[PDB]
């Protein structure tokens, strides 16, 4: 089955904060409300050490 859950990061934050939070929490991807664009984004760890940021833009 598909287990439904609500986004953990409730409050809006910056892309910079999102990346740090993902790292401190030990995750590989992190869903958040971008406070600078008022849109939901997803940051993730790329297999090249870099970070990726997915936006609806």
Could you say which residues in the range 1-57 bind a copy of itself, by CB under 8 A? 1-7, 15-16, 19, 28-29, 31, 33, 40, 42-44, 46, 50-57
Question: Least distance from C-beta 13 to a copy of itself, angstroms?
Answer: 13
d(CA 39, CA 10): 13
Here the tokens at position 56 are: 């609806």
Cα distances (angstroms) measured from residue 34 to each of 7, 25, 45, 48: 13, 18, 17, 24
Q: Report the interface residues with a copy of itself, using CB under 8 A.
A: 1-7, 15-16, 19, 28-29, 31, 33, 40, 42-44, 46, 50-57
């Amino acid at each position: 089955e598909i287990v439904k859950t609500k986004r953990f990061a409730i409050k809006p934050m910056s892309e910079e904060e999102a990346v740090l939070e993902m790292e401190l929490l030990g995750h590989n991807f992190f869903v958040f409300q971008n406070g600078d664009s008022n849109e939901v984004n997803v940051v993730y760890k790329r297999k090249d050490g870099n970070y990726g940021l997915i936006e609806p833009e």
